[PDB]
Structures are given as structure tokens and as C-alpha cells.
């Protein structure tokens, strides 16, 4: 078997699968197999992409005896996996040892559930491969904000409750410790604003650059016009996030980094709309 991974903490992979649901629920899923860990990649409409990673440390056994190629790529549907694991989690209270397996190209993705009495085995059919171009430039970051998970989840839930057809993000740090970070929404209520606090427990670090990630300046704000349909795709991932890192460059790509508690790392890349700017500035100067 070119790849084999065993674990009993099935809640982690369950949260990995429930964090992949927001990006459509009946479509194809890319799984990258490498020595470092197990990663799921999903892309929607060429505008947003998620990338979860299950590290080797999450499995007691992680062989990867494959030698011809450094990384293995397979494409399997997500509806099949969801519909299977949904009925498999009927007796999840039992001590289940999940076993992932993949024998190479042309072989199905195996998912064995052993309870020491019953060994359910499922072979998922692998499809042809149609996902990196949607990555921010690391030398062009205009703002870098570290936000707590609970606050961001609450803000996203509020924006959902307000409707929030369109969304805006602000990143301004003035001369003093005036770190301003807000999530403005264009909703039925009108022009609503959710301002994150400047205190260090919610907003640990805000740093605004001149599109080079090296020169810090104050008094200038970076504006991001995002469709809330794509912005709500990170709500289910922030629900289990300890700290969330926000990064955006001048090309209009927002990279949400979510770390869970080791737990699971979630990377979401989001594209910016064409594009109200003066209205944003006037509302936040007010």
C-alpha cells in the first residue's frame, strides 16, 4: 500500500470534513499525499480556495512507502464521502480506528472503520484531476492582522444575520496604537460596521505595509471589497479557530490562516471584487 494512515481521534477528521462542507457540498475534492501530512484542497468558481492539512503527528502510523513520486494527487467526490461517514457516525461512541489507504493511480481511496468486531471497508472511486494560482504573493502584503477566533466567528454570524450581500474590510494603524480593523457590510439595514477592538486580546497584531511587507506606515488604510458568499466560507472554520491570521496583498487576494488546538491548519484564499470607497472612509472617520 503506497499510503497508509491510522488514527482513533476521528473527531479531528470529522471536523476536517465539516470544515470542507462550506465550499459546496456535491463536487470534487483534491487530496494531496506527501510525507509531511494529509491535505484536502477545494476550489469554487476559481474565486476561493480552501486547503486543510492533517499532519503526520495526527496519526500513529503514516508510512508513505511511495518512492517514485514525492507527492500523490487523487480526486474523489465529497458527496460520496459525506454520505458514507454520515451513516458510519451512527455509533461513533464506539472505539473506532480509522485507516486511510491509497495504492496509487487507478486504485480507490480506502477508508476502513474497525470496532474490534466489525471492520467496515469503503473504496472511493478516484476521478481524473481537472489549484495553486490562487495564492497571495508573500512579498506584497498590504496588511497583516491576527484576530481571535471567537470574535471573528461572532462577527461573521452577525453579518450572516444582517444578510450582508456585500462586505468590506478595513486595515488602518495610525501614529499611536490606533489599530483599526472593521468589517463593513452592505446589507438591508444599510451600511453596517463591525469594528474589531484595538486591545491585544482580540486583535493581537495589526501591521499595514506599502505593498512590500517591509515598510510600516500609519494613516493609510487598505480596503478590501469581498463578496460575502465567499466570505462566509470561513465561518465554519473559524468556529473551531483559536487564532486567525488575515493577510492581503495589492493584487486583491485575502489569505485567511486558521490554526486549531496539533489540531488542523486551514488556509483559505479569497479573491477581491472589481469595485463606495469614499463612503467607507467617511463612515469610519465618523
Amino acid at each position: 500500500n503506497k499510503f497508509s494512515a491510522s488514527t482513533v481521534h476521528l473527531e479531528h477528521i470529522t471536523t476536517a470534513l465539516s470544515c470542507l462542507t462550506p465550499f459546496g457540498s456535491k463536487d470534487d475534492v483534491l487530496i494531496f499525499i506527501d510525507a509531511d501530512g494529509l491535505s484536502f484542497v477545494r476550489e469554487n468558481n476559481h474565486v476561493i480556495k480552501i486547503q486543510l492539512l492533517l499532519s503526520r503527528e495526527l496519526f500513529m502510523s503514516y508510512s508513505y512507502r511511495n518512492e517514485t513520486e514525492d507527492h500523490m494527487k487523487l480526486c474523489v467526490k465529497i458527496n460520496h464521502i459525506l454520505d458514507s461517514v454520515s451513516v458510519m457516525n451512527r455509533n461513533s461512541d464506539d472505539i473506532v480506528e480509522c485507516t486511510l489507504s491509497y495504492d496509487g493511480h487507478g486504485s480507490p481511496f480506502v477508508l476502513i472503520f474497525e470496532d474490534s468486531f466489525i471492520s467496515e471497508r469503503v473504496e472511493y472511486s478516484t476521478y481524473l484531476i481537472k489549484t495553486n494560482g490562487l495564492e497571495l504573493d508573500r512579498e506584497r502584503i498590504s496588511f497583516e492582522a491576527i484576530i481571535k477566533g471567537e470574535a471573528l466567528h461572532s462577527a461573521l454570524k452577525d453579518l450572516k444575520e444582517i444578510g450582508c450581500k456585500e462586505c468590506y474590510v478595513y486595515a488602518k494603524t495610525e501614529a499611536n496604537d490606533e489599530n483599526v480593523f472593521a468589517l463593513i457590510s452592505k446589507s438591508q439595514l444599510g451600511f453596517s460596521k463591525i469594528k474589531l477592538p484595538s486591545n491585544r486580546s482580540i486583535l493581537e497584531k495589526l501591521q499595514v505595509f506599502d505593498g512590500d511587507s517591509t515598510t510600516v506606515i500609519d494613516g493609510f488604510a487598505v480596503i478590501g471589497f469581498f463578496d460575502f458568499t465567499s466570505f462566509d466560507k470561513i465561518r465554519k472554520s473559524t468556529k473551531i479557530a483559536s487564532k486567525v491570521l488575515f493577510r492581503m496583498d495589492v493584487h486583491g487576494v485575502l489569505s485567511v490562516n486558521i490554526l486549531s488546538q496539533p489540531g488542523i491548519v486551514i488556509e483559505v484564499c479569497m479573491l477581491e471584487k472589481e469595485s463606495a470607497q469614499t463612503e467607507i472612509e467617511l463612515l469610519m472617520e465618523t
Binding site: D103, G104, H105, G106, S107, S125, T126, Y127, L128
Partner: protein, 330 residues
């Protein structure tokens, strides 16, 4: 056991008679791996389904077929939704890993075949939703379309599919196969028989083997150990006897409308098929030397119109009577 049609079905590509222009190409495919998209069209009972099944068996084998073959026919739904999801998903599937036995005994090409039999019954939208499915996944999936009327296949789809026409199986190219079946079923026949069967069965070997099976059943039942004669096969087929045809044409020569009306009324009670009597009248009237060029020119169109009307599913009493009245007034 089983009907001789489902008992003498070609198992390999060497048992497919009368179609070498396509079987040779499909055999050359076995050594190579560049099988194109195929469009099999021809008259009914010419061997298209048998040819494709034999090719599939020879390419994959019984074990790998269940994973590398998808067959969709008119007996299952093939709407736009099915075409856009199920066929697309099967084309998108990865080629399954062949076993060591399969690799050591069968060529095992690195692609799968989607067989769409009776594709003429598919709607135009469903066929349009196939074009890019075939084009994009051509290197991992192959398509075979089976139909009887090539016009019912849209031009874009017919362009991407290699066209293989299956010839009609007449007495000059299928006599050997029917002889083989006869000698392997111990069927005794007179000289001339097994050729009249193929003449009655115009381009159809399925019917020329079902007729032979029925003749053999009856001959075994009667139990005199005598050969099967042309009369028996003709009667079993449904061919009108020559005396009845001569009476029909004499009535036509008479011209009286009521005489023809009453003879047709008493003839339709015998249950004879209108197509068969029309065909026999065609043979008589065209191959005879007692009629002028103008008579034949007019009657050819008359028979053509009658046959076209009959093929549409119309009353045979009204069409036969009209044809005979018309032939009486030329």
C-alpha cells in the same frame, strides 16, 4: 437451451461475417491503443451489437469488463440530466488497475469504453451535451454509438465519431454463416434453400436464423426425415403464394373497381402483411418484360408512395386497395 440467435452470437471478432472493412480496423486496434470514437450504423440485424461486444470481450476480458465498460441503451433513461451527470462522471473516472492475469492475457488498453446503443432514440439536447464530454476525456474514455438511422445523430456528434457502416447481409455474404449454423444444428435442406431464407430476410441474419430455427422445429416435429423445402420456409416467413399474387394481378388487369374491392376485402382476411405483398408486386411489375417504360416509371413511384405510407403505421386495407386501384388505372 437458447434461441439460435442468442446461441450463435459471435463471441470473438473472427465470427462476425460480412463486415471486414470494420472488423479489420477494430482488430488492428487490439495491438495498438488508439481506438477512436465509433459510430456503428446499418440495417437491423447486421451485427453491430455483436461486433462491439466481441471487441469489448477481446480487449478487456470478463473480469475487467465490469469496471471498464458502461453500456446505456434505450431501455434506461438517457435524458439531459443523466447525460450531464452519469456519463460525465464515468468518463471522468480513472482507469482501474488491471490485474496481473489481465495484463498477461489481455491487451488491457489504458481507457474505458462507453457504449450508447440505440443512440437514435436520444434527444438532440442529450447528444449536444456529449460533444465536450467525448472531446475532453478522449484520452481516458472512448465512446461507441450504435444506431440504425444515422440521420438521427446530430452532425457535431457524427463528426467526432468514426463512421463504420455495417453492410446488409444478403445471400452472397452470409450464406457461409447460415450453412455453418445448419450443419452444426443438423438441419437438412434442399438445394436452393438457405438462399431463399436470405432472400426473404432482406439484409437481416437474425431473421434468417430465426426462420431456419422455426423450419427445423417444424421439420423435427413432423418426423419423416425429409429435407426442408423452399415452400415451407416461404410459408413460415409470410410470403404470399404465387397463385394468390397472379389472381390479384389478373383482377388488377380487369380494372373493375368493385371486383378489386371485394378481392382485397377477402384477401385482408387471410392476414397477409401489406409490406410483403407490396414487395412481391414490386418484383413482378419491375422485372417483367411485358410492360412499357412509362408503366414501370409510374408504378415505381406508386409502390414507393404506398411503402412510405405503410411505414408510417397506416391501415393496410386502405393502402393496398388504393395501390391496386391505381395500378388498375395506368
Amino acid at each position: 437451451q437458447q434461441p439460435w440467435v442468442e446461441k450463435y452470437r459471435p463471441k470473438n471478432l473472427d465470427e462476425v461475417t460480412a463486415q471486414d472493412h470494420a472488423v479489420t480496423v477494430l482488430k488492428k486496434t487490439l495491438k495498438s491503443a488508439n481506438l477512436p470514437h465509433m459510430l456503428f450504423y446499418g440495417p437491423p440485424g447486421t451485427g453491430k451489437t455483436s461486433t462491439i461486444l466481441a471487441l469489448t470481450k477481446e480487449l478487456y476480458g470478463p473480469d475487467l469488463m465490469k469496471s471498464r465498460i458502461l453500456e446505456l441503451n434505450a431501455s434506461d433513461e438517457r435524458g439531459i440530466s443523466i447525460v450531464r451527470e452519469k456519463v460525465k462522471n464515468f468518463a471522468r473516472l480513472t482507469v482501474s488497475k488491471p490485474s496481473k492475469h489481465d495484463l498477461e492475457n489481455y491487451p488491457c488498453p489504458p481507457y474505458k469504453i462507453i457504449i450508447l446503443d440505440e443512440a437514435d432514440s436520444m434527444t438532440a439536447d442529450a447528444q449536444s451535451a456529449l460533444r465536450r464530454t467525448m472531446e475532453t476525456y478522449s484520452g481516458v474514455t472512448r465512446f461507441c454509438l450504435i444506431c440504425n438511422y444515422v440521420t438521427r445523430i446530430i452532425d457535431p456528434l457524427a463528426s467526432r465519431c468514426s463512421k463504420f457502416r455495417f453492410k446488409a447481409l444478403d445471400a452472397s455474404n452470409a450464406i457461409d454463416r447460415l450453412r455453418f449454423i445448419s450443419e452444426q444444428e443438423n438441419v437438412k435442406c434442399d438445394d436452393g434453400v438457405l438462399e431463399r431464407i436470405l432472400d426473404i430476410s432482406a439484409g437481416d441474419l437474425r431473421r434468417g436464423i430465426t426462420l431456419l430455427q422455426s423450419a427445423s422445429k417444424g421439420a423435427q416435429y413432423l418426423g419423416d426425415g425429409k429435407n426442408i423445402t423452399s415452400t415451407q420456409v416461404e410459408e413460415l416467413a409470410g410470403v404470399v403464394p404465387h397463385d394468390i399474387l397472379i389472381e390479384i394481378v389478373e383482377k388488377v388487369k380487369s380494372g373493375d373497381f368493385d371486383e378489386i374491392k371485394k378481392y382485397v376485402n377477402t384477401f385482408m382476411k387471410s392476414g397477409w402483411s401489406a409490406a410483403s405483398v407490396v414487395n412481391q408486386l414490386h418484383e413482378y411489375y419491375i422485372t417483367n418484360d411485358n410492360f412499357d417504360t412509362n408503366f414501370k416509371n409510374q408504378i415505381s413511384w406508386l409502390l414507393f408512395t404506398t411503402d412510405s405510407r405503410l411505414n408510417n403505421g397506416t391501415n393496410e386495407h386502405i393502402q393496398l386497395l388504393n395501390l391496386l386501384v391505381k395500378i388498375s388505372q395506368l
